[PDB]
């Protein structure tokens, strides 16, 4: 349970996630120096938390964590199998990550 492929790109659209499945990872960037690694969503059926909070110096599902000290423009996530993301012009649509023959890929969200 860990997707290798990145989410696709539909000509004209935007994708985001709200519900993070247990497994999801984020690396803290800012600048970094502390003795830490990743932020890791962990939990049972009751609730779920984030394990390893981040600091910087000078020189079923879990919500998105509270902003820290020096975040960059973009924050990258490591998704898991099961994860779902949602996709200036009208349309007349959701991307899911699946695994069949030992192969993981995000299904093309038929817009």
């Amino acid at each position, epitope marked *: 349970e860990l997707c290798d492929d*990145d989410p696709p790109e539909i000509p004209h659209a935007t994708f985001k996630a709200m519900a993070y499945k247990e497994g999801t990872m984020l690396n803290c960037e800012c600048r970094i120096k502390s003795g830490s690694l990743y932020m890791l969503c962990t939990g049972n059926s009751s609730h779920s938390s984030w394990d390893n909070q981040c600091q910087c110096t000078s020189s079923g599902h879990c919500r998105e964590p509270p902003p820290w000290e020096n975040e960059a423009t973009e924050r990258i996530y490591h998704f898991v199998v099961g994860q779902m993301v949602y996709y200036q012009g009208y349309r007349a649509a959701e991307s899911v990550c699946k695994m069949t023959h030992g192969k993981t890929r995000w299904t093309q969200p038929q817009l």
Partner: antibody, heavy 116, light 107 residues
Framework: QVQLVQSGAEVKKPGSSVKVSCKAS????????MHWVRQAPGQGLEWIGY????????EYNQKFKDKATITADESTNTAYMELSSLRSEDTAVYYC?????????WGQGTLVTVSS | DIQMTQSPSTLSASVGDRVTITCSASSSISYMHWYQQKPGKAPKLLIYTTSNLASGVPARFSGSGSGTEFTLTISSLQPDDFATYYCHQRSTYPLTFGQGTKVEVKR
């Protein structure tokens, strides 16, 4: 079918640097990540990291952070991996393996021997 | 880091025997993968997601397990089956492999 061919064996002096190739065929290059792995003599298998040819973004493990740098280019369909300051402890066989799930398509392997 | 422990390290057996290797994870994991390796070659995928046979693999292989204790079996050893075997996990970073198990011919 899908085939990835690696560069020949190398012998290096301590403190130097070397760059390894892995050319790909039988599929569309930028749709998949490429991973790297080394196998030391006697020792088991160890995962270095990956690259995505669409973006250029890399991820590593907390071992080979400041020792390796994955690189690639879509123009010629090859992935690279440079080793920074060679020590005798770096001696091993280096594999490129294609991503997309569980490892399945590997290269031939490349030997790097480091001594004075 | 999730590290894993294989056992035994070395197995001596005969054509026609039954075989069983074990891999022990430090934490609870969802699936386990297995490879086969012969001298001078890259690893070959053997069993994916804990029990499914890769294409080209003969019916005599399989696997099972859950939680922290996984295992693979061969019901009847053939001559081609002599080699080295590795377990593998991929539910968190970094990715880690097992140490190894070598199957030699008992004489």
């Amino acid at each position: 079918q899908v085939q990835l061919v690696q560069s020949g064996a190398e012998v290096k002096k301590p403190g130097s640097s070397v760059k390894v190739s892995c050319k790909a065929s039988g599929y569309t290059f930028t749709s998949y990540r490429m991973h790297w792995v080394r196998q030391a003599p006697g020792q088991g298998l160890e995962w270095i990291g990956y690259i995505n040819p669409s973006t250029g973004y890399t991820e590593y493990n907390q071992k080979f952070k400041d020792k390796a740098t994955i690189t690639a280019d879509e123009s010629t369909n090859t992935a690279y991996m440079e080793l920074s300051s060679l020590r005798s402890e770096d001696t091993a066989v280096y594999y490129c393996a294609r991503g997309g799930g569980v490892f399945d398509y590997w290269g031939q392997g490349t030997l790097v021997t480091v001594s004075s | 880091d999730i590290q894993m422990t294989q056992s035994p390290s070395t197995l001596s057996a005969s054509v026609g025997d039954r075989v069983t290797i074990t891999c022990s994870a430090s934490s609870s994991i969802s699936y386990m993968h297995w490879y086969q390796q012969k001298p001078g070659k890259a690893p070959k995928l053997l069993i994916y997601t804990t029990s499914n046979l890769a294409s080209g693999v003969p019916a005599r292989f399989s696997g099972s397990g859950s939680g922290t204790e996984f295992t693979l079996t061969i019901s009847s050893l053939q001559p081609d089956d002599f080699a080295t075997y590795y377990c593998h996990q991929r539910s968190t970073y970094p990715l880690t492999f097992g140490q190894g198990t070598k199957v030699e011919v008992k004489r």
